Design a protein around this nucleic acid. Sequence first.
DNA 1: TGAAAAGGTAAAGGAGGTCTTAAGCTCGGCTCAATT
DNA 2: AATTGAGCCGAGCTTAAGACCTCCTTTACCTTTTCA
Lengths: 62, 77, 232, 236
Amino acid sequence: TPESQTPIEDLQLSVRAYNCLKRAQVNSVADLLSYTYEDLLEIKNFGQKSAEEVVEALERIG
Amino acid sequence: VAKNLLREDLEGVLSTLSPRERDVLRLRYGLDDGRMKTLEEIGQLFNVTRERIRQIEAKALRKLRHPNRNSILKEYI
Amino acid sequence: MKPRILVIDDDSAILELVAVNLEMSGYDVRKAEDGIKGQALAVQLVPDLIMLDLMLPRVDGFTVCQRLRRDERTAEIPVLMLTALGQTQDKVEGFNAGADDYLTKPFEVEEMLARVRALLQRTDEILSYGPLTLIPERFEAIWFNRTVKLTHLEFELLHCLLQRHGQTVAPSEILKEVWGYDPDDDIETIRVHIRHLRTKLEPDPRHPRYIKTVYGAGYCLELPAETELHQH
Amino acid sequence: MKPRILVIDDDSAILELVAVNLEMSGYDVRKAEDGIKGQALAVQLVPDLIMLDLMLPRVDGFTVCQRLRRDERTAEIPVLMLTALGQTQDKVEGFNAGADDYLTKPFEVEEMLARVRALLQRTDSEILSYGPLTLIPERFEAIWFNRTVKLTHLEFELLHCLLQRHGQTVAPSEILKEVWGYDPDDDIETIRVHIRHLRTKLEPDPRHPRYIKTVYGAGYCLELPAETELHQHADQ
DNA sequence: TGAAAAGGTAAAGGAGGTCTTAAGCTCGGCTCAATT
DNA sequence: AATTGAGCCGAGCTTAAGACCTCCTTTACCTTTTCA
C-alpha cells in the first residue's frame, strides 16, 4: 500500500529509536513489519518504551 | 559400521566436558585400552589420590546426564 | 603408556634407590651399570628419558651424552646428568655435553620427580589460596578460621571462581564448567548461587568485598594475599 | 632475530645483574619490576623466555606463572622461576604452578646462562602497558601510576583504542569503527561525553587535561610520559 | 572584532544487568528389609 | 559380605515478579577554539 512504502524517516520516531532501527538496516515499513515485537525488543538498545512508540506511530499511519 | 559411528558421537559429547573430566571417564571405562582401571591406578598416575577421582567422575556424569549435550545416544539403547 | 626412563649409574645403591622411587611413581624403569650397555639400551629401547651418571668406568658420562646426541635415534632424548658438583672442569665439560638439566647428589626425591615431571610435560587445581582452603572429600571450605559447609553446586561454583582467582569469569563460562549447559541457557540460576556464596562468605552480603560483581562481565573472586590476613 | 628474554624481579640489583649478563650474551632483555607489569609485557611481547621471581608485589609469582599458562599466547613460553628456597610449602605450591625450572638465589651466573641456553634450545599482540598505565582486561581496570581505576566496558575499550595509538591522533570515525563498530557517519558526540569520564578518572585537573589531549579538528590523543619521567608526575 | 564550528558538562530518561522473595518441586541420605 | 532398592522424610534445586542499582544515550546550553 502507499503507506508501506513510506521511509522510516517519516515515522517521526525518536532520534534514539530511529538511529537504532537504521543501525539494524531497517529502511522501509515493510522491513519493520518483517520484525515481531520480540524481534523489536532484541534490537540492541531498543526498549519496550521504544517499541510502544513504534506501535503508536504505526497506529498513526493506520 | 555401527561401531565407528558410535565412538565419534561419544567422543563429541566427551569434548564438551573439561579435559580432566573426560580423561577420568576414558580411564574409568577403558575407552582406550579396553581395560577398566580402578580409582587407585588413576590415584597414583594422576595428581590427586583416591576419593578424588570419584568426585570428578560423578561431576562429569551429572553433566552428561543432562538433556543437553547428550541426547543422540538415548536411541542407541 | 607408562613413560620409559633409562637410569645409568654404577652405584648399585643409588641406582636401586632411583629405580624404586621411579617405579613407585609409576614409570617403566630400565637400568644399566655402564655407559656402553647404557648407550646400547638407549639405542635399542628409545626411552622417553635418560638419567645418566657422570663417573662411569671406561667412558665418562660426557662422552656418553655426546654420543647419544650424535645418534639421530637418541639426539632428541632428554638427558638428566647426575653430577657430584665439585670441580669447575666438570662444569665446563658439561657445558659442552648437551645435558638438559643437572641434579646435585645428594638430592631430594621430590626434586628429582619434579624435574622428571617437567621434562615429560615438555616432551608432550588450586585447593588453597590465602584464607580459602577447599576440602573436596567433604565439600567444605575453610574460610579464614571457620569451616563452612557448601552444597555441591555452591562448592563447584566457588572452585570455578578460585581456579580463576582475581579474574572475572563470564556467566557462560560458569554455565559450561559447572552445569555443562549450552552458553545460551538461562544464567539467572547462577545469580542465585553466587548470593548463597556471599551469604556464607561475606561479612555483609549487601556489600560483598571478595565475591565482586563486574556489571556486564560476570563475577570475580578477589582474595587477600597471605601477608594481609592479620588485617582482615 | 635476537632471542627476547623477559626478566621479572622486584630486586632491582638482581634484575640489573641478570639483564647485564644476558645483554653480554647478546640477548634482547626486557625488564619488569612487578608481576602485573611482567604479565602485561609477556602478553604484549610474547618473549622467547620468561625469568620470573617468586615474591612479586600485589601478585605472587605462582599466580603470574599460572596466568601465563592460562593464556594461549603464553602457555608455551618457558618460565625459569627464581626462588629463595627456604620452606617446603612454597615447594609444594610450586609443584602445581607449572613452572619449567627453578633457580635458587644466590645463583652462579654460569648456571643461569646454562639454564637459559637449555630452555632456548628446548623451545626450538596488543599494547597492554605503556609508561604509567597498565591495562587489566580481565577486570576492566587501569593501573595509572600506582592507583587502581575502575572503568566501564566502553570506557576501557576507548582507553585501549587510544593506547594502541599512543602519541598519535585518533579520528572520531576510527574510534566509532573500532570500539563501537558503527558507521563513520554516526553521531560522534556520544564519544565526547565518555572521553571526559576518562579524564575525570585519569587527569589531575579534568578542566586542563595534560594526558588526554584534544587535537582540534582531528580528535583525541593519549600522550604518556616516558618511564624516565615518571618520578616527576606521580606527585601530581 | 565578529563569527562560524567544534568540543564540552550537567541533566532526564531509558536500557540492561543484577539482585530480592512466595510457590513448588525432586533428590539424596538414612534406615532397614531383602536379598545374590 | 556386599549390594540394593524402598519408604520417608526434610535439604538441595528450579520457577516467576518485582524492585532496583550501573551503563548508556541524547539534549539544552553553553564555552572554547581557528579564521575572514
